[PDB]
């Protein structure tokens with residue numbers, strides 16, 4: 001029938017993870033390029049589950065810890081055509097549109113540094129796919145106007161992403 | 164793992180857009196995407212902050228739509244989900260702008276059809292969207308006559324095609 | 326309550342399939358145009374599940390084989406606002422970014438020529454949605470340096486997509 | 489090489505967008521870009537076919553704007569130039585859609601300011617656009633007070649920013 | 651002061667030319683990739699005027715005639731950071747959005763198979779820039795409604811780009 | 814009638830400049846955001862020639878040197894709706910696609926760190942437009958196979974933008 005499995009995603013402090021689905025072996029080189037040409041100091045590991053042929057986890061990196069995190073999560077999800085990116089010295093918003101526009105990339109499941117689970121379906125031996133993710137925690141309530149003011153201030157005075 | 168079905172209310176004249184993003188700036192960037200797309204668009208946006216205070220963050224120029232968006236976020240109750248309700252605009256008027264907001268990771272639905280969201284709860288307070296049910300299944304396959312009728316609809320009625 | 330079903334996706338040799346979610350009847354015409362204006366000589370079929378009103382599988386094609394493959398998969402998936410595209414004489418990378426930018430298109434579940442299953446949830450009679458896909462097979466191992474050299478060679482000497 | 493200046497009329501309530509494209513499908517694709525961007529947009533589009541019959545090709549849902557666009561194409565008289573006049577929409581509502589039309593190669597201007605097009609004629613019937621003059625040169629540099637005033641304009645008046 | 655020069659662009663039957671401006675040496679590889687990954691049968695030459703360093707016309711191609719056309723036009727325009735693409739077996743609409751989205755690419759001056767001139771300004775020795783182009787001929791008149799019907803028919807029955 | 818002027822563009826070592834055309838006052842804020850959200854630690858100045866009303870050079874920056882460079886160039890070009898961006902700690906390729914997709918931006922004339930001139934037409938007092946630019950220098954020759962190997966090596970071993 002269908003077996004659901006939960007995969008916990010380790011996210012060390014200072015990293016962000018991006019998980020998606022693509023196709024074709026060139027994914028690995030195109031994602032390498034999207035990352036290194038987006039932010040000069042970026043440190044990353046990228047791994048991609050080739051789904052046919054030799055069926056290898058394909059990987060590039062300029063940081064060995066991040067390479068191994070990416071590889072290990074691909075091994076655990078173990079679903080054809082999934083890719084995993086771990087990054088330091090850059091935020092997902094710095095690279096996401098580049099990633100969306102890689103022609104091999106078909107969808108992105110998560111971009112986050114929160115506690116994160118991946119929900120995987122195994123339908124037959126060695127046939128697995130991503131069902132969804134659980135990105136952080138459910139809401140505790142609704143923000144107030146003063147909470148709104150606070151987050152506006154955060155964006156303007158702290159991270160300076162807005163004026 | 165438990166699955167839950169969330170019914171999505173869609174008042175006449177509105178459309179809903181449901182997706183997933185990350186980072187608090189989501190709500191400001193989605194506000195701008197909408198307001199700069201269509202003059203006179205009316206909307207409510209709500210976004211599930213998934214860490215820290217874990218507050219539903221919201222922007223709107225219509226209070227009915229604000230509160231619909233907030234309600235649905237609370238019902239779905241999945242981290243980093245956003246909901247947009249719109250009036251005086253169609254999803255096609257705004258969707259490419261939304262896709263290109265850097266915080267936005269994925270869109271699950273854009274529609275006015277009867278709609279359900281399928282949510283997985285894996286543990287208390289840890290939920291995610293596993294799909295949507297957008298309207299109903301097919302009743303059959305269109306004929307050449309049906310084709311001619313939808314071609315005329317797009318050219319004579321809504322005038323989106325020549 | 327919720328029933329999960331598995332739909333097998335036929336893929337004749339020489340074809341690729343792209344499956345996604347959209348909305349609005351204009352989907353069919355816009356995807357037609359996206360395909361035909363991308364690659365001279367592309368052969369395709371496109372079907373879309375209109376999810377209200379007449380609830381007809383809507384379709385366009387320049388190849389009858391591919392039309393019927395697209396229509397048949399839509400009948401089997403049977404989920405509102407899902408679209409299916411079968412292509413010959415073009416690869417998904419040749420058309421995907423065009424498809425992504427169609428304003429009706431909201432998400433793409435798969436683009437592939439691998440063995441492929443679609444996981445569909447039926448929540449009540451006539452109410453179905455796509456939960457995920459199973460694209461090819463789980464990984465057999467992790468790429469070695471030697472395997473990386475072979476992948477690089479393939480991209481440079483065989484398909485000539487990299488220099 | 490001779491240079492000519494073409495004055496561009498801009499009626500109150502309109503904006504003009506001038507660029508360069510190629511291939512007859514330009515006009516249909518620009519029509520669709522506009523009509524699917526903003527409900528109730530009013531427009532005229534004209535495009536200079538630069539071979540074959542060399543006819544100005546045009547689409548519109550407003551006759552005043554159609555004819556303005558046609559007139560300007562004739563005055564510029566440069567192969568593969570297009571002109572769009574719009575009402576009930578702003579250029580920012582439609583420009584990204586226009587940029588992404590595959591026939592469109594470049595955009596010279598989007599504005600309601602007084603505007604001139606600079607055209608080079610190299611030989612009879614062989615002309616091209618060499619630039620535009622969009623409004624007037626700067627009178628000075630804004631102060632912090634001026635800054636605060638434009639920030640308030642964008643947040644309190646047009647509400648494009650928070 | 652400023653010297654204006656007119657460069658005539660040869661366009662052999664069955665080719666199209668794309669002329670633009672970019673920056674950075676990676677332009678040449680990224681444009682190669684944009685072209686070869688857009689249309690399977692595409693034949694092309696691409697040349698780019700490196701504007702500093704060794705200041706070479708940089709080039710890639712899978713067709714030697716087109717390579718030489720591209721190189722020769724770069725030599726004649728002789729303006730820093732200009733690029734030239736000649737293509738067969740594909741139309742500009744098949745590749746243009748990919749080209750626009752190459753991060754090195756800053757503008758496109760022309761995409762056409764019409765009689766074409768490039769207007770170049772030389773301001774000082776070996777300092778040249780593109781002022782504009784003359785793409786085909788000035789209009790002879792305004793199309794009628796029946797002319798409109800004819801071009802609609804062309805798009806629907808002949809090239810089949812619209813329905 | 815028409816006077817042509819040549820504006821020299823100062824480019825301190827470590828900076829790049831991007832010059833373009835936009836419209837509407839929101840240009841300044843949207844370009845600010847495009848820059849700051851692209852690369853952590855980017856330093857920039859952005860100036861824009863408001864072309865009606867008060868006709869003020871509008872500006873935003875996180876670095877006073879770069880602000881004044883941007884403002885000064887706008888004063889010298891002195892053409893309505895032109896924008897200038899100077900950046901440190903980021904390359905144009907890191908930000909260009911974001912800039913291209915700002916809805917106010919209509920065209921980009923240059924992105925470079927080379928010697929650069931802007932050609933401005935003055936058609937009457939206070940009425941100026943950008944005609945073109947002269948980005949670096951004319952080519953000295955055509956790339957040999959040996960030169961191509963060196964270019965490839967540079968991209969793979971030095972800047973690591975290609976594999």
Ligand SMILES: Nc1ncnc2c1ncn2[C@@H]1O[C@H](COP(=O)(O)O)[C@@H](O)[C@H]1O
Nearest residue numbers: 016091111112113114159185186214215
């Ligand atoms: N300054 C920032 N810039 C860009 N993205 C951020 C920033 N801070 C947090 N994020 C992203 O937004 C998510 C939620 O924010 P946080 O409140 O830090 O848990 C993080 O997991 C990051 O993926």
Ligand SMILES: Nc1ncnc2c1ncn2[C@@H]1O[C@H](COP(=O)(O)O)[C@@H](O)[C@H]1O
Nearest residue numbers: 178253273274275276321348349377378
């Ligand atoms: N005129 C229109 N323009 C754009 N989108 C539309 C229009 N009419 C319907 N839609 C969208 O397409 C979906 C299906 O349409 P309907 O067949 O009218 O139920 C709706 O729920 C809307 O999201």
Ligand SMILES: Nc1ncnc2c1ncn2[C@@H]1O[C@H](COP(=O)(O)O)[C@@H](O)[C@H]1O
Nearest residue numbers: 023024025052053341416437438439484
């Ligand atoms: N030469 C190619 N160009 C583009 N896409 C390809 C190519 N070869 C394979 N693919 C795609 O990548 C997927 C996996 O490749 P394969 O290893 O050939 O089974 C296929 O299912 C195709 O969708």
Ligand SMILES: Nc1ncnc2c1ncn2[C@@H]1O[C@H](COP(=O)(O)O)[C@@H](O)[C@H]1O
Nearest residue numbers: 510511539540666741761762763764809
């Ligand atoms: N069937 C076509 N598909 C795509 N582009 C075309 C086609 N025919 C012509 N073009 C382009 O449109 C331009 C003008 O068309 P023509 O009427 O063939 O001179 C040509 O120079 C080509 O660049």
Ligand SMILES: Nc1ncnc2c1ncn2[C@@H]1O[C@H](COP(=O)(O)O)[C@@H](O)[C@H]1O
Nearest residue numbers: 503578598599600601646836837865866
């Ligand atoms: N509210 C607005 N929304 C979008 N664009 C605008 C708006 N107001 C003015 N513009 C554009 O910006 C240009 C400069 O504005 P103004 O200062 O009002 O002359 C105009 O010619 C319009 O093209």
Ligand SMILES: Nc1ncnc2c1ncn2[C@@H]1O[C@H](COP(=O)(O)O)[C@@H](O)[C@H]1O
Nearest residue numbers: 673674675702703829904925926927972
């Ligand atoms: N490492 C790099 N990454 C990105 N862009 C660069 C890099 N090096 C040079 N550039 C850009 O390409 C242009 C020409 O390069 P150069 O050969 O270094 O003078 C410069 O003016 C920069 O704008």
